[PDB]
Amino acid sequence: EVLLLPIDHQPANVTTPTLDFTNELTNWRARVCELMKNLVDNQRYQPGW
Amino acid sequence: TNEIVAVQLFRPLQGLVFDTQLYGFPGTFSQWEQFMKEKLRVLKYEVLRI
Amino acid sequence: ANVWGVRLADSLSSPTIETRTRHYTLHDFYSDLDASVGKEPWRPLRNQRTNEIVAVQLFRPLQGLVFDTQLYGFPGTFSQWEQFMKEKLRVLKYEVLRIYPISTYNHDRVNVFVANALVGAFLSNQAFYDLLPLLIVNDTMISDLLGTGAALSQFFQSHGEVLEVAAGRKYLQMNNYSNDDDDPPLFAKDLSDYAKAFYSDTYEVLDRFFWTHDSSAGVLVHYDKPTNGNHYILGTLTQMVSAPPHIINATDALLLESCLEQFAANVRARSAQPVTRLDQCYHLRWGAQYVGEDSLTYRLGVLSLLATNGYQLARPIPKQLTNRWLSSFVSQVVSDGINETPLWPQERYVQIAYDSPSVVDGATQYGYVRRNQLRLGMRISALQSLSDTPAPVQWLPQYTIDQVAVDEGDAMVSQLTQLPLRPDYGSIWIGEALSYYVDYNRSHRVVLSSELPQLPDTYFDGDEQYGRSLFSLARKVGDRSLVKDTAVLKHAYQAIDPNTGKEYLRAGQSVAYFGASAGHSGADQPLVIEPWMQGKISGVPPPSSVRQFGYDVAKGAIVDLARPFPSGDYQFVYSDVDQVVDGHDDLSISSGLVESLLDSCVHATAPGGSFVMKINFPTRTVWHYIEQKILPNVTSYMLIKPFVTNNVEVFFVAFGVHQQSALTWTSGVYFFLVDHFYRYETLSAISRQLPSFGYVDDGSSVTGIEIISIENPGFSNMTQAARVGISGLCANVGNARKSIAIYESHGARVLTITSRRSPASARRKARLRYLPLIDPRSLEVQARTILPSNPVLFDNINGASPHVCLTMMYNFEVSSAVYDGDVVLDLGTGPEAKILELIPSTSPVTCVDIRPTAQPNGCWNVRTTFLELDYLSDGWITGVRGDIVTCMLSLGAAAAGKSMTFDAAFQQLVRVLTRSTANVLLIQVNCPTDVIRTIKGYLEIDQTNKRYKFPKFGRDEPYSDMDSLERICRAAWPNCSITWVPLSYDLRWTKLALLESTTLSSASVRIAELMYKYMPIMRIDIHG
């Protein structure tokens, strides 16, 4: 009766969805972007730009 | 060093299941505990209103 | 109560005498425009936590700050702000003194409106010069405003005999203000325009204007002594934010400020200080036909009416207000319970009480109406507050004559129960060990090995381990081994041996030590080695060399002490290792380890010397072996027992090893050992009943604590339910000590009743049928803040006094001598007779004292009797009869009161006991038994004049001796049989001290023994 899935699945609270950012994929995208922000911010890799 | 590197919390709060990036706590224990004090003070006033 | 939150009126006060005010002078204008140190137009307000200036208060020389502080541009620090204000007032000062000379205008008037708008237009840089020549006023005050010089609607506009002005900025916020509740409130007085004022001549013209003007937000008046002529207040829709739960608008903020000012004035009225305004409140005029019932403005109007009447609050207000206390006040005023006063606000007129102390209706004429039909049953005088203490204070109840059921008391205490909380435990036993010693006497007696009593066979019980662990965990020490070793050396170096005339041992004996634990948080050895080598014990001779042995040493070697390992022989060895750790929980292996360890200790003694043994588990084999083996081959011996822990171990000391001697055990050693095992059994039975160390109390055990929590609204006569609850806790507690605390618990002032239950209290509570009830007045008088403390199991810390110890002794022997179903008589019952707590629940009393007591008369199961008749007299025992006489401490008290001797007092008392019907009796006499010792600080002696003079009580009485007592007793009764009781050396009495939860401080019980041998009692039957 049970089904396996790679990602956490919280059910819908409401039947009228609307955008918020409180999930794992947005957190993933934000931390990846944060590391590339650090990667461009480091003074050893490029000040050259 | 006897420096505070971790905290232990109990019964009045357990619902910290979300991400600490969404929370935004400081790095020193004194600023963290006064921050927790004033946020509990605001929620204290709210729940004592209701 | 309680209008909506409680107020403590009980009387009502008001400021009677009044300062008539002076008016403007331009000399004063220059004087207070010059910002002197002594006086200046501002005044700072500070925090109550940091005392940092977060707000300022300004007054009469400036009010025209109605524009925006972005347009003004003040700095953020108070010092820079005040010097900035100083220099700007200096520039405008020079300008206005250019345009007006002081000599001609020495004493001419001004428009205060023109002055405030002038300094406001100068600070806001808004072309003040057209406003400038309208400064000095004409014949009247307002006609210069009506016929305008230049119409300046940014400051004031005319409306045909009605002047509109925009009064703003009574206060000014500094940037460090951050809406803290400890910061002072602001009441929305720092915004741009909190309200609008309508100055004009007459209220008729103003109400003809209000026919057409809006009155949606309500209108406020002052009616007493207005600032610049008769006017109104029109608040706007700006709201106050600084209270975190509540959001109030401008009009409620002004009315709340004014009503709290009147509440402040009603307390400070002392019938000698005239104030600047007779009353303060505003009295909403036209909004009552707009807003309705159960609105906040209406409720504050009710409170302002009561404040103008002159009521006073319940809680003492602070001198400097806080947002915390203000929001607590607003939460109290929007609560419940609409009204109890007969007063209601009106729009036609204002009303004051028929018995109000205010005289403002006769003072000023218009608006204030005296009412005749409404009357108040309250008083006239002032009210004062009590001084709070941070410590919890004791309380003592007083009993009334009414009674209800103990089941009703049980129901009320079940309603008011706050039992399940963990208390602080404390310590049951402080001080030091006790000297329990006996020496061998050669010519004393002779006994055999089989006669000795032993450990009880119920030794390895879980309940016995529970009790001994409870005792050893509750007891408080430094190092127990330190205490034991100091005691055993101080008893070891006392007497002399029969061979040598000198003493036992000398200095420099080159001793050895067995069984060193070596863990004592530093100085890794037992803690007696260094002070005993230095001679710090001051009763010992110092040794020469010390060796420590045992399998836990730090400096010596680790050796199995049971199996004989030979080493260097020393003149003195000291065993300290048990047979429990090396044993395997068996009496047989314990006895065998005693065998082997004592054998090795005998064979390693360097003969002619001595040794000390400790024995945890002695058996038939142990005693029989040492009697058949060691007692022949020893010169003398010693067995002592210092006591810090509840255990069966003793300290056996030998003397003069390896010399043959016909030498056995004696009956004095037998009595010592019988009494040792007996006091072990009694104290184990005591420790078995007490609850554990780290428990939570819930009122289930017979001993323990109890607290309840009620709240008291004002000085109201509180309900019968709480009265039954408090009196039921009194019947539960049984006249023991109790402490209370008064503090605002989380928005409400609370009461705590903290005390402790006992089985003697249980038998007292079972003795009486109905519980009596108490006086609520002794609780309803208090208005101070008694800060609470944590619940502790033990109130006493330093230990019980020896007088408490002798009282416990006496109570114990009276409770042991009394039986169930018996009439008694207590001579000198004291303030509260403990004989109610001693006897069984079914036996009556016939008790009497010269002291008038406050015991609950009536509502008993078995009857009681309380009266006063000067008991050292006759004729009354012919009226009331008894069976056994208990006269404790009243003999010396009556003898010191009547200045008469014990011989005359005792012969009179035994005469009126020949009048009695009692067969047995026991009275407190004061007889020396031993040679008198003149105990330091408690009991000194007197040979000739024959007194004692207790210095602690400050009391003094003679003493009579036992042969003269025998002479009087046999002259009275030729048939009597007297038995002097021995001193309670077996500690049977200790249960009545422990179950009342009080530590003892064993120096006090040593002094108690040394004192109890100087006033004993006896038991006399009339037959024998």
Ligand SMILES: C[S@@+](CC[C@H](N)C(=O)[O-])C[C@H]1O[C@@H](n2cnc3c(N)ncnc32)[C@H](O)[C@@H]1O
């Ligand atoms: C109660 S302690 C004495 C503590 C010592 N008075 C002190 O100052 O710390 C008994 C000590 O003797 C040791 N012991 C017990 N049985 C022993 C045996 N058969 N041989 C040698 N040592 C033993 C234990 O290791 C323990 O440290």
